[PDB]
Amino acid sequence: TELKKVVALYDYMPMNANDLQLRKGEEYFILEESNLPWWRARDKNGQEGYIPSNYITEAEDSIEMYEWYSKHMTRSQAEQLLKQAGGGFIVRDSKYTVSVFAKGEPQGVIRHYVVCSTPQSQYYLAEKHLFSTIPELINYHQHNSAGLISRLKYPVSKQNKNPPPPPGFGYGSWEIDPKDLTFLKELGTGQFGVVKYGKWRGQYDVAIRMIREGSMSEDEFIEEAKVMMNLSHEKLVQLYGVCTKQRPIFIITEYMANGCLLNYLREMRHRFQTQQLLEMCKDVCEAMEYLESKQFLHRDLAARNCLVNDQGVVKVSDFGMTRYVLDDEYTSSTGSKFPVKWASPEVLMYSKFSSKSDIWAFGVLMWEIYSLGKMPYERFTNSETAEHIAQGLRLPRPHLASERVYTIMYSCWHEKADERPSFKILLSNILDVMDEES
Amino acid sequence: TELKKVVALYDYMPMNANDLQLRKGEEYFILEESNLPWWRARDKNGQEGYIPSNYITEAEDSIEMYEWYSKHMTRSQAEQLLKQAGGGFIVRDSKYTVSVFAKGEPQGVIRHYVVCSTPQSQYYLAEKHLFSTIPELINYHQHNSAGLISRLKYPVSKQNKNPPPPPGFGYGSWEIDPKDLTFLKELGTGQFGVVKYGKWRGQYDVAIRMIREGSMSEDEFIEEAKVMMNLSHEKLVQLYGVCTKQRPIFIITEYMANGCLLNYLREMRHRFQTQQLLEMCKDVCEAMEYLESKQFLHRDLAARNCLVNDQGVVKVSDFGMTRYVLDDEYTSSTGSKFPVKWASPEVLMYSKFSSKSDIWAFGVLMWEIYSLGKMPYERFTNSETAEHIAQGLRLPRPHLASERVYTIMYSCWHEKADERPSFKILLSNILDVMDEES
Ligand SMILES: C[C@H]1CN(C2COC2)CCN1c1ccc(Nc2cc(-c3ccnc(N4CCn5c(cc6c5CC(C)(C)C6)C4=O)c3CO)cn(C)c2=O)nc1
Ligand SMILES: C[C@H]1CN(C2COC2)CCN1c1ccc(Nc2cc(-c3ccnc(N4CCn5c(cc6c5CC(C)(C)C6)C4=O)c3CO)cn(C)c2=O)nc1
């Protein structure tokens, strides 16, 4: 049947003819197993005989066969023998513990590192390398195992690295030269004029926005043009400059290939997925957090007022351009072209726009992003919408929105403006839910 | 004042005379810090000028300066770029996470190892090497750091290794030869005869126990001598043999230098400390657990009935010798020499000794060990002791005993015998409290 084998704990010289000579380190195969103190075994040389049971070590008992494990050693005695030894690695039972000495530093320092046991029969240690430097840890794992699937010696970078939008086509270059502008095609028309994609110096992809007669207050616009030019963020359209010497003054800004994210979600639904609109909302929230840090108010925040580039990243645009609108039906709170769908309570009532109103509009933007572009309150009217917002009604939950993101965009719509979240904490929560989704 | 410096995220060619040429990798010292998008810096070559803020990386921002960290990377996109890369170490923000690929095994396997942040500004990873072999882990740490005070390459062993007691002076050697016995000195007198320390064959330290006339039932003793010889344990005195051919029959057993632990704790109080009596109790409990596994009953368990050797380890002795006593005053339950102090309720009442009675006696032994040898119920008498044990009284807590060990030795004294603990769980609890003390 099955055969048993043990190691020679110590060495024994047969005091009796019926005994076998044990020799420390020479494994012996037990021939019979009983409860008596002596059992018959056989040696590699071929001799067999009875031998003491107090001299055998089971195959799995190799722990005792080693010169480190010491079941008798405790967390105190071990430190007393490690101080007299004066770094000695000594193992003791406790499912075990290890002790090492510290060597400079004459005051001996002892550590009691405990050995933990995995539920899957494995063993490890509750100790972390504690790298105070991330690249130092990356280099360590690069030249070590550390229980990883492989060494961290295969960087995962990309070659599609494009510089960011130049904060203006040159320092102090507020006035663009129409001669440099290289009009190429047309990008549609805007509230104040017509757009067209060209190239500054024929080497920088710019989007020229020519104005319409009696559409914007060019004077005030140029007055605050330096201000609006000082606004620069990754998720923010980069205003390159303005050609004011020529009429209509040309607002040369960053170019976005996909155009309005609203149409991107309502027509270009064959280029993204349901797991990316959250990243779009993160981009929008980052832009809003920046413009809030700048004490600037978007004033008009909506998918229509956001653009998307070839890389698929969404960025806010037309930041704070309302102040330079001439259409009364759009500027007035009771006008027809006024976006009541995204407007807020205090706005619609007393015209008290604020960062809280921008947060309300951002919540509406998240709702429509998750709705794929469906218009808010498609069934209601400009007055019924205010009625329902006052009564307490809120936009429903899109079929693709989780309860978490719905709670986010709902907190964005708190009746009390002073209670509405800030864009910073909104971005924090969006990042949290993103890390959870992923 | 203080000087600032950053790294060149990308490379920039001055489109304007007021600009400075940025070159990826060339650190630049920012001359002035503002909120504008362009700031003036100076280069190592000595040239200074305005440069974009979107191209600078703070010194602590080196994370982005590396080609691994990717704040945009998520737990999904990262796995999509790692599968197309097909083990690539890619870091992303999340306070961070790392991803590596698996290479054999054509079905790509990706891991999402998260990077943890210590409260002390350090960084580590929630990953264990998971060594399924203790000596394999010891070898790994022996040739690695693993965040240890030092490599596990300094064994902490001792040269004072003595073989254990030979389970008898030879196999089947039940009858010792008085000629071999080498009587040396005297060790005192016992209940049945007189003792003396000698040497078997002049080479094995043995303790001969010569019997007294009309003190023991030599016939029954020799009858069960093979049985009592089959009892062998580390914390158990090792009966070497019996010379029955000569009168008085000499019980040659293991020699213990310190003698009775009772006198060891009552006179030899200049060789141990208050942190070792717990180990003594552990030794006694191990012996009791073994003799319980053997369905053998000590019958008389007490510090007096335990010996100690030069190494300071205590071992039980005279295991089950009561059956071979001739003194009626000691055998009878109502006799004068009967140890009522250690006796149990059922014993004193109906004479129903059992493993529960042995557990009671072991609790009493622990109490007296922690009392330094004080006699149990020094004020009471044989009858008042039973009175108080029946009423519910129990031995008090020695000044050196913690509430935990007191609860242990108190559970040892449960009124209901069927409820008294087992020696196995008692040893488990003693080991637990020992690891806690240490
Ligand atoms: C999507 C493709 C589809 N393609 C079809 C498919 O085969 C042909 C045609 C092209 N089309 C396309 C591509 C790219 C772009 N990109 C860009 C659009 C615009 C743009 C265009 C028209 N109106 C506007 N708006 C709309 C908002 N708004 C304006 C002014 C004001 C507002 C609100 C206000 C009240 C604050 C005032 C305003 O100007 C804008 C945004 O400035 C600006 N910039 C810089 C671009 O890069 N757009 C569209
Ligand atoms: C401590 C030093 C001090 N030293 C002084 C200091 O300067 C001089 C003198 C020596 N002394 C000393 C040293 C070593 C030893 N060791 C040994 C003691 C004994 C021993 C001695 C006397 N009585 C007994 N008992 C006592 C218990 N018991 C006996 C028989 C029975 C019992 C109970 C019963 C009812 C079941 C029956 C019985 O025999 C024993 C235990 O067997 C046996 N063995 C094997 C030893 O190795 N003892 C004493």
Numbering used by the authors:
A (entry chain A), B (entry chain A): 214 to 299, 302 to 309, 314 to 322, 325 to 659
Paper text:
The TEC family kinase, BTK (Bruton’s tyrosine kinase) is best known as the target of ibrutinib (IMBRUVICA), the first-in-class covalent kinase active site inhibitor used to treat chronic lymphocytic leukemia, mantle cell lymphoma, Waldenström’s macroglobulinemia, and chronic graft-versus-host disease. The TEC and SRC kinases share the SH3–SH2–kinase domain arrangement (the ‘Src module’).
With the stabilized full-length BTK mutant showing low activity and a more compact conformational ensemble in solution, we built a full-length BTK construct for crystallization screens that incorporated the 4P1F mutations and the ITK loop. The resulting construct, referred to as full-length BTK with stabilized core (FL BTKsc), provided diffraction quality crystals (5–7 days at 4°C) both in the apo form and in the presence of various active site inhibitors. The highest resolution data collected (3.4 Å) was in the presence of the GDC-0853 (fenebrutinib) inhibitor. A 16.9° rotation along residues 346–384 in the SH2 and SH2–kinase linker is observed for the domain swapped dimer structure solved here compared to that solved previously. Notably, there is no PHTH domain density visible even after the structure is fully refined. The result shows the crystal is full-length BTK protein with no evidence of smaller BTK fragments. The solvent content in the crystals of full-length BTK is high (67%) and crystal packing shows large solvent channels. The crystallography results are consistent with a flexible N-terminal PHTH domain with the caveat that crystal packing might limit native autoinhibitory contacts between the PHTH and SH3–SH2–kinase regions.
